[PDB]
Amino acid sequence: SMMEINNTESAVGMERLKVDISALTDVDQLLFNIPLDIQLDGPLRNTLVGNISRYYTHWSGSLEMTFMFCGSFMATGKLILCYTPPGGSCPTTRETAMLGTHIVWDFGLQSSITLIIPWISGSHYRMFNNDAKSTNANVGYVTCFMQTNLIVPSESSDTCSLIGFIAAKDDFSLRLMRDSPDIGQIDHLHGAEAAYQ
């Protein structure tokens, strides 16, 4: 299931499921900064795993997040994906992306790349006495950097796009179901008070 990979709030609706890679997007630039946290605003909001695990408090397990490049057939470019563990800082450059656990995905010949994430574990915490603070958790990041310039033929489009999906493995599991706060009670729906007639 796709994620809202474009974290820019100007890009909303359709083109927030995709990120643009152009010839002017240069080398060693952070292209997306997906956090691996479920119940806070970001790419992991309107996903399958995020929305189903918003019905639950605890969502420990592993996710199987898959990216495919959506460019031309000969749209070749080396692109480094860095995943960071919950204990650590978010990478900002290719140099600190290389030190962490990372893969280098050249999408010249491979169209879809497939990432396996070890044991993301987050929950909902209400440790404060009746405060209802809705404590959150940061338990990971998946980042993107440009290993080289994306090059294209002159007749093809330079602004080549990229989408990505996320799934779950068998060790992913949920516990202690709750009401999902995605939709609140509107209490003035037009179809209401008609079944009540």
Binding site: S1, N46, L48, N51, I52, Y55, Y56, H58, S60, G61, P86, S121, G122, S123, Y125, M127, K133, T135, N136, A137, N138, V139, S173, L174, R175, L176, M177, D179, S180, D182, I183, G184, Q185, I186, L189, H190, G191, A192, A194, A195, Y196, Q197
Partner: protein
Amino acid sequence: AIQTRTVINQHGVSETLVENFLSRAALVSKRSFEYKDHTSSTAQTDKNFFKWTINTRSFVQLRRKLELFTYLRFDAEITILTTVAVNGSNNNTYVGLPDLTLQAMFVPTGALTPEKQDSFHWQSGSNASVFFKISDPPARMTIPFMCINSAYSVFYDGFAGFEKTGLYGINPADTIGNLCVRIVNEHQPVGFTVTVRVYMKPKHIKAWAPRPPRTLPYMSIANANYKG
């Protein structure tokens, strides 16, 4: 904005079953109907009895829970929790709360839905009713799977008929029933504002063709219109 993390062992798969996931008795309909003695028939067909067509789309959270799946088969365990409340005042020590009984009658498709608290449809007999009181535990009726197809179309891509207008999503099937709750007792000199909070617990749940959940807020029960 405190950020804390905990390690969860979490060696369970049965808590994410569809049966456990939808088998929670959630509030599906609630209103207070004014049973207080009607010498004059005012605000008819809703005053002296509680009518509600049995649908899961009336409340938003439980609605978004069951339209996670396209097709659903469940025997809806209906738990009816009625709490009366005397409107007005009589004295200061105790107003006196009678143990009045209620006919929580279930009116299926093809059956006559009552239009008043003293209509002849209440004494039909064919459509099954439970008679329970305030002092009694709340009425737990597990109604069976009432649909002429084999699952509840919580989305129905189509109309009830080839003509008229406004039947999109209205299955001729499903239409689980008309939960009609009255007070069997003749009108007391003092009045009660009884609110019927009925809870539906789906039981023996099988889900088919699972879907994306609803993400923008709902705007109507009958359709799936959106504020984009």
